[PDB]
Design a protein around this nucleic acid. Structure first.
Ligand SMILES: [Mg+2]
Ligand SMILES: [Mg+2]
Ligand SMILES: [Mg+2]
Ligand SMILES: [Mg+2]
Ligand SMILES: [Mg+2]
Ligand SMILES: [Mg+2]
Ligand SMILES: [Mg+2]
Ligand SMILES: [Mg+2]
Ligand SMILES: [Mg+2]
Ligand SMILES: [Mg+2]
Ligand SMILES: [Mg+2]
Ligand SMILES: [Mg+2]
Ligand SMILES: [Mg+2]
Ligand SMILES: [Mg+2]
Ligand SMILES: [Mg+2]
Ligand SMILES: [Mg+2]
Ligand SMILES: [Mg+2]
Ligand SMILES: [Mg+2]
Ligand SMILES: [Mg+2]
Ligand SMILES: [Mg+2]
Ligand SMILES: [Mg+2]
Ligand SMILES: [Mg+2]
Ligand SMILES: [Mg+2]
Ligand SMILES: [Mg+2]
Ligand SMILES: [Mg+2]
Ligand SMILES: [Mg+2]
Ligand SMILES: [Mg+2]
Ligand SMILES: [Mg+2]
Ligand SMILES: [Mg+2]
Ligand SMILES: [Mg+2]
Ligand SMILES: [Mg+2]
Ligand SMILES: [Mg+2]
Ligand SMILES: [Mg+2]
Ligand SMILES: [Mg+2]
Ligand SMILES: [Mg+2]
Ligand SMILES: [Mg+2]
Ligand SMILES: [Mg+2]
Ligand SMILES: [Mg+2]
Ligand SMILES: [Mg+2]
Ligand SMILES: [Mg+2]
Ligand SMILES: [Mg+2]
Ligand SMILES: [Mg+2]
Ligand SMILES: [Mg+2]
Ligand SMILES: [Mg+2]
Ligand SMILES: [Mg+2]
Ligand SMILES: [Mg+2]
Ligand SMILES: [Mg+2]
Ligand SMILES: [Mg+2]
Ligand SMILES: [Mg+2]
Ligand SMILES: [Mg+2]
Ligand SMILES: [Mg+2]
Ligand SMILES: [Mg+2]
Ligand SMILES: [Mg+2]
Ligand SMILES: [Mg+2]
Ligand SMILES: [Mg+2]
Ligand SMILES: [Mg+2]
Ligand SMILES: [Mg+2]
Ligand SMILES: [Mg+2]
Ligand SMILES: [Mg+2]
Ligand SMILES: [Mg+2]
Ligand SMILES: [Mg+2]
Ligand SMILES: [Mg+2]
Ligand SMILES: [Mg+2]
Ligand SMILES: [Mg+2]
Ligand SMILES: [Mg+2]
Ligand SMILES: [Mg+2]
Ligand SMILES: [Mg+2]
Ligand SMILES: [Mg+2]
Ligand SMILES: [Mg+2]
Ligand SMILES: [Mg+2]
Ligand SMILES: [Mg+2]
Lengths: 182, 185, 58, 159, 172
RNA sequence: GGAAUACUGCCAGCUGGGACUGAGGACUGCGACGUAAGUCAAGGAUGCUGGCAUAAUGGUUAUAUGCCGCCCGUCUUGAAA
RNA sequence: AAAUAUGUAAGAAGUCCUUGUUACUUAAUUGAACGUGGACAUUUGAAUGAAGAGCUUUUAGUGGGCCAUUUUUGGUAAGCAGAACUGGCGAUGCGGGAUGAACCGAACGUAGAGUUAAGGUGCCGGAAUACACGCUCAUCAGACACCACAAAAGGUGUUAG
RNA sequence: GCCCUGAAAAUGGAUGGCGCUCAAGCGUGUUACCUAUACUCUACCGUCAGGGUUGAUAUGAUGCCCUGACGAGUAGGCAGG
RNA sequence: GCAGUCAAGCGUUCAUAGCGACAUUGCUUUUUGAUUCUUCGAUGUCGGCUCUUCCUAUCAUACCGAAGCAGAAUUCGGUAA
RNA sequence: GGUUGCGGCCAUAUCUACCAGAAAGCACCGUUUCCCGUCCGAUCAACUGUAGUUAAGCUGGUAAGAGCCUGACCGAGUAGUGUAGUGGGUGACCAUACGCGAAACUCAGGUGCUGCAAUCU
């Protein structure tokens, strides 16, 4: 906040660091999808409509999001959203099984080797990204969101968010969506 | 709906009990499903599986295959296990002492093994002596020895063996077997 | 009675049902087609190195 | 009738480069090829002997043999639903060491060394490649740089 | 495309070897949110300079609020727009209380009269007309007379209930 | 010049109305409130009260009413044809 | 000379040090193959995923296909003939397009509560005869993708330019 | 731009119908609302997977038990009845 | 088969009263073809006779507009089946 | 730095015209007994390094030179193209969204670099 105020004061422009994290929601059904984006949709663990996952933004994931774009709607999650998403809908993957994160014991049992021995340890490793994001985030089952309570705000979903809504990078706006899907 | 990546409701390709109805066999099986469940000891978990196998997957361990396996260094005092039956081999003369746990022994096999001053015990007899497989030396027979597998992979240039009911010259020996009759395989 | 002549329609789908993989690599692979006289002499370097390493067992 | 001869369809593939015809220079004969070497294939149409078939044009494989005037390359060819393994006998004029393979080895050496210097201080390394990260914050200054502000341009024909 | 907003969008080519600190460019953009604003920056910046956003960055986004939002004024609007058969330049006047208002009705108008959707319209320049009677188009000029007043004949009151027990009057 | 307010976002802020569900069946887990005894909304509903007896309730059947439903079998790219 | 497609590589079957074998090879204890002994196991050498990997045997049905976007050959053309990649129909109901193989949405165990999609909300018909700025009057108006057609040409209608 | 002319076919008929003219038409924007066998939570059936459990302890060890996921189907294969 | 746009020409003179070349936009499905979707366990295959009804691109009849309409005769066009 | 022998890459090295080049080298050049080849000692072969000369080869310099090479917000984000929509249009076709992106043009710079060995005012 104050970095921006100071650069302004000095007649410059503070420019933020590009976002290290995105959350992704598949908003397309499963049939009539072309092989390539279809494949990508799976490797991002997004194989049913309205499921979601977090992605670390680097060049090599950035081009996945490109390839997959008219099927998903994504952006940058707030702490608030990441917190409610894991609390309400966070399940862990253990011996192939999908287990709810009812107690902190469950996470430590599995992520303890990496640090991470509470749910907010998990959240932290997600929003800050870094060290064991791979593992912590993979530990999280894809989130099974509902349809948005209050609608999609748009006449038709399968245009770009810029074109008249849904699909593509809606940036910050992702949060309002996911909050009605959560 | 779910874009499946995997066949749903697929069962493991693995036997889970023996196919047999042999009362006694289901008891051995009942033994080691306990031993393998309630111990670690890799050995039990193996025999428990080996019990489910079919007669092809349990080819005979020979008496000489045992005699040789004992020539291994630090072997001679181990007790060789054969979850299957042990046959006799006329071709070794010197046959050592040692105690052999199997499922079945042919007449001549426990003959050899005993007369050499050695023992022939059933598996559950083994189970009590060695609940954790102590000094056991598991042995498996030559699977790929069957007459059946000679024909597997039969094809041009595959070098395999035709399914020919009655052999000789005049029996699939001409065109396609020699450069002089059409060509060669 | 003319009938359809050709296509590769579906043939990809078919190939990818249980297909592609690659084709199985092996340290110590098939000396099929490798230069005979190189091989011949290689048989003898091999006999030697082994025979030589017998000079440590006795 | 249809025609499917051995060099069919290769009017431009086996063509010489523009103003690069005639004599193949002597660098091509001085290069040395070992087994396990990784080579690109690219036929020289003036060297009609030991050409690759047109399929293998642009494919890259491993040397399994070094004969007098040729190498044997192993190519994995897709046929049906499985990869099949192919033995090729190419004269040296149709072969080329792979650059990306030579860069790999350089990075192996580079990796050994970085590892030396690091361990010769017991310190950590990170020897493996990370992909292009986001971007940290910046502060652009406005001195000498008061934003020229642009706008869209009207339509205008000119024929 | 909704409730419009005006944005100062500022960006520059990414820094390099030879040009540490390149030149900043600014646009004013009527879009309905930031994500569109920044995208419409890069749209034009491709067409004017030859930057692609892959090789550039967005230094600042600022919302330009209207100075005197409760002062009625006369805006002149310059427009480039695409038709079913050609692409043309326009000038029109819009009387309103804010820049953002002016644009909304511009965009509506282009759409009613010439069937021009948002995509087929570049906004060239929008500028308050300081000196009255620089006002060029009549449909505005007729509101600029001294002591302007008009009636609003035939007034149709919307009914709540479906039956009414009196024959209505249109009598404003 | 000093304020408000809109817009946007956050609260592990408080709170009213309506709806569907109540799987499980000794204990065991993680907790919370307590100075403690002890209490609790903490690994799935209990309490209080009323109604029904030639009846409440339910199954079946007939009919009516709202919406929906072409003839099976076959060959076929395609059948109510 | 693009775009899109397309080969290979990103290490333990690896790296370095010492020096052993041979009949091959070198002017040559030179090489080339293959090894002994020693050293390096934190990121062992990009990302993401892995619902487990590998593998063997045997056998059914099929071997008339058709459709859509795009590429595209023949033809004046065709609901015509013929190829290309993918997705469909065929084998598949369900919600939408009144109607309908193939479009849009979405794929199906028996159910409850919620939210939606594509598509709709005057009445038939569940759902604003909602809000807002314009445009249009047709003695042949018009009314929504696929789709159930319209052209050269023209108007002192009217609107904006 | 919209409208008018250019604009001719055979039973009587089709923006789906009625009907609609500051629309119930055309272009655009903003909200709310209706609705799938899809999405979210829950029960139950089955299938598959992973575990636990006869140490002596009334009547099912191919059984009991805990947990997770999944369910379209012609020709056709197999299994259980 | 039928109808347009252009206007070089024809028409004593005069493009368009009536025509209209070189080109070019269309419409029609009583021509002929192209295709092979429907019917090969069967839709009786030309002409005429008889009778009804429909289309209009109107031959006559009604009322008009036009002319290279003096009159008579005619020709072009409209509303008209 | 010059030069020569053997080269690498193979025009920034080629082409046209005109100047210049010390020293060494290279060359042209002298000769026909011998080996050797020609219609022809021209080429090829041998002999001398002796009679001669930088005239040419060669080497550099010159040129709003031809070609070639490099670059550029020069054209141009043009043409073309991957993906998206129940986008526009009667249609040919077009625009928008996430991306890639030329050629012709214009202008600016350049005109061999380099390895082994011998040698030189
Ligand atoms: Mg609400
Ligand atoms: Mg609601
Ligand atoms: Mg909106
Ligand atoms: Mg919700
Ligand atoms: Mg035999
Ligand atoms: Mg053989
Ligand atoms: Mg035929
Ligand atoms: Mg056909
Ligand atoms: Mg066929
Ligand atoms: Mg041909
Ligand atoms: Mg060719
Ligand atoms: Mg090339
Ligand atoms: Mg030859
Ligand atoms: Mg245009
Ligand atoms: Mg435009
Ligand atoms: Mg709150
Ligand atoms: Mg209960
Ligand atoms: Mg009753
Ligand atoms: Mg019905
Ligand atoms: Mg029937
Ligand atoms: Mg048929
Ligand atoms: Mg039928
Ligand atoms: Mg590939
Ligand atoms: Mg088969
Ligand atoms: Mg078969
Ligand atoms: Mg067959
Ligand atoms: Mg395609
Ligand atoms: Mg399709
Ligand atoms: Mg069929
Ligand atoms: Mg379907
Ligand atoms: Mg329709
Ligand atoms: Mg689509
Ligand atoms: Mg809609
Ligand atoms: Mg009705
Ligand atoms: Mg209603
Ligand atoms: Mg009128
Ligand atoms: Mg359209
Ligand atoms: Mg007009
Ligand atoms: Mg007519
Ligand atoms: Mg109509
Ligand atoms: Mg229209
Ligand atoms: Mg409207
Ligand atoms: Mg719209
Ligand atoms: Mg609207
Ligand atoms: Mg259901
Ligand atoms: Mg089923
Ligand atoms: Mg005249
Ligand atoms: Mg004339
Ligand atoms: Mg005439
Ligand atoms: Mg026919
Ligand atoms: Mg019939
Ligand atoms: Mg009949
Ligand atoms: Mg008859
Ligand atoms: Mg008429
Ligand atoms: Mg008239
Ligand atoms: Mg006259
Ligand atoms: Mg007369
Ligand atoms: Mg007369
Ligand atoms: Mg007359
Ligand atoms: Mg006429
Ligand atoms: Mg009549
Ligand atoms: Mg002579
Ligand atoms: Mg001479
Ligand atoms: Mg000579
Ligand atoms: Mg020279
Ligand atoms: Mg020049
Ligand atoms: Mg264009
Ligand atoms: Mg394109
Ligand atoms: Mg759609
Ligand atoms: Mg249309
Ligand atoms: Mg285009």
């Amino acid at each position: 906040i104050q970095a921006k105020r100071d650069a302004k004061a000095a007649g410059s422009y503070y420019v933020e660091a590009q976002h290290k994290l995105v959350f992704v929601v598949r908003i397309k059904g499963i049939n009539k999808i072309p092989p390539k984006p279809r494949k990508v949709l799976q490797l991002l663990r997004l194989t049913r409509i309205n499921s979601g996952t977090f992605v670390k933004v680097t060049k090599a994931t950035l081009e996945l999001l490109k390839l997959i774009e008219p099927y998903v709607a994504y952006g940058y999650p707030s702490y608030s959203t990441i917190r409610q998403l894991v609390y309400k809908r966070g399940f862990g993957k253990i011996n192939k099984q999908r287990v709810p994160l009812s107690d902190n014991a469950i996470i430590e049992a599995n992520l303890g080797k990496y640090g991470i021995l509470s749910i907010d340890d998990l959240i932290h490793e997600i929003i800050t990204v870094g060290p064991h994001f791979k593992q912590a985030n993979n530990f999280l089952w894809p989130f099974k969101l509902s349809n948005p309570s209050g609608g999609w705000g748009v006449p038709r979903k399968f245009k770009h968010f810029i074109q008249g809504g849904s699909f593509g990078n809606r940036e910050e706006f992702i949060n309002k969506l996911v909050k009605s899907m959560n | 709906g779910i874009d499946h990546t995997s066949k749903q409701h697929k069962r493991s390709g693995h036997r889970t009990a023996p196919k047999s109805d042999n009362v006694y066999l289901k008891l051995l099986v009942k033994l080691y499903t306990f031993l393998a469940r309630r111990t670690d000891a890799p050995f039990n978990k193996v025999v428990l599986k080996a019990l489910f196998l079919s007669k092809i997957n349990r080819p005979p361990v020979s008496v000489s295959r045992i005699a040789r396996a004992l020539k291994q260094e630090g072997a001679a005092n181990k007790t060789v296990v054969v979850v299957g039956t042990v046959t006799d081999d006329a071709r070794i003369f010197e046959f050592p002492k040692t105690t052999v746990a199997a499922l079945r022994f042919t007449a001549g096999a426990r003959a050899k093994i005993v007369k050499a001053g050695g023992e022939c015990i059933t598996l559950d007899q083994l189970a009590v002596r060695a609940p954790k497989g102590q000094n056991t030396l598991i042995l498996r027979g030559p699977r790929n020895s069957r007459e059946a597998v000679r024909h597997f992979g039969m094809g041009p240039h595959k070098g395999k063996a035709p399914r020919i009911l009655s052999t000789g010259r005049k029996f699939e020996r001409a065109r396609g077997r020699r450069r002089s009759k059409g060509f060669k395989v | 009675a003319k009938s359809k002549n050709h296509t590769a329609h579906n043939q990809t789908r078919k190939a990818h049902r249980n297909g592609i993989k690659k084709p199985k690599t092996y340290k110590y692979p098939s000396l099929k087609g490798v230069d005979p006289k190189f091989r011949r002499n290689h048989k003898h370097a091999l006999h030697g190195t082994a025979k030589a390493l017998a000079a440590a067992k006795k | 009738g249809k025609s499917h001869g051995y060099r069919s369809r290769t009017r431009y593939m086996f063509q010489r480069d523009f103003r690069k015809h005639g004599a193949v220079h002597l660098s091509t004969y001085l290069k040395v090829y070992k087994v396990g070497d990784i080579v690109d294939i690219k036929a020289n149409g003036s060297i009609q002997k030991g050409m690759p078939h047109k399929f293998y044009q642009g494919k890259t494989g491993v040397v399994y043999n070094v004969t007098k005037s040729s190498v044997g390359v192993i190519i994995n060819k897709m046929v049906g639903n499985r990869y099949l393994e192919k033995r090729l006998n190419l004269r040296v004029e149709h072969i080329k060491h792979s650059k990306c393979r030579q860069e790999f080895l350089e990075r192996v050496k580079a990796n050994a060394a970085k590892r030396a210097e690091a361990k010769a201080q017991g310190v950590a390394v990170q020897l493996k490649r990370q992909p292009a990260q986001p971007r940290e914050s910046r502060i652009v200054s406005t001195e000498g740089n008061v934003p020229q502000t642009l706008a869209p341009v009207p339509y205008e024909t000119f024929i | 495309m909704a409730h419009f907003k005006e944005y100062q969008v500022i960006g520059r080519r990414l820094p390099t070897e030879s040009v540490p600190e390149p030149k900043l460019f600014r646009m004013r953009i009527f879009a309905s949110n930031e994500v569109i604003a920044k995208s419409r920056y890069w749209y034009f910046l491709q067409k004017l300079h030859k930057v692609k956003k892959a090789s550039g960055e967005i230094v600042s986004i600022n919302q330009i609020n209207e100075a005197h939002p409760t002062k009625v004024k006369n805006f002149g609007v310059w427009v480039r727009y695409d038709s079913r058969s050609g692409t043309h330049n326009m000038y029109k006047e819009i009387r309103d209380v804010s820049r953002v208002a002016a644009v909304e009705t511009l965009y509506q108008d282009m759409a009613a009269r010439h069937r021009a959707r948002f995509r087929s319209i570049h906004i060239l320049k929008v500028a308050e007309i300081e000196k009255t009677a620089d006002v060029k188009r009549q449909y505005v000029k007729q509101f600029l007379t001294k002591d302007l007043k008009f009636p609003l004949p035939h007034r149709v009151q919307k009914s709540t209930k479906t039956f009414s027990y009196k024959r209505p009057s249109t009598f404003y």
